[PDB]
Amino acid sequence: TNVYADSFVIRGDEVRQIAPGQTGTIADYNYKLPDDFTGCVIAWNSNNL
């Protein structure tokens, strides 16, 4: 019905928080994913930029 692209940059460690049902620095204060989230978390290295 719609697609929403949510865009940001984080440590390659803290990427492990971006999933439904998680906690931590990013999950707690920056970006929280709902328990019934439908979607794809797409992330890639950007140490070139």
């Binding site: 439904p20 049902g21 328990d35």
Partner: protein, 49 residues
């Protein structure tokens, strides 16, 4: 509920729900069969009356 966060708790609670609901269904099925036995005995007693 005092000890696990939601997505981890939900697995545990679904186990409890499943087994408690199977305990209830067992109780109510045995009560339907006991109810038929007493129903027969009440019909007999009404005939004897």
């Amino acid at each position: 509920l005092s000890r696990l966060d939601k997505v981890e708790a939900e697995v545990q609670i679904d186990r409890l729900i499943t087994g408690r609901l199977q305990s209830l269904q067992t109780y109510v099925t045995q009560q339907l069969i006991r109810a038929a036995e007493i129903r027969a005995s009440a019909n007999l007693a009404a005939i004897k009356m």
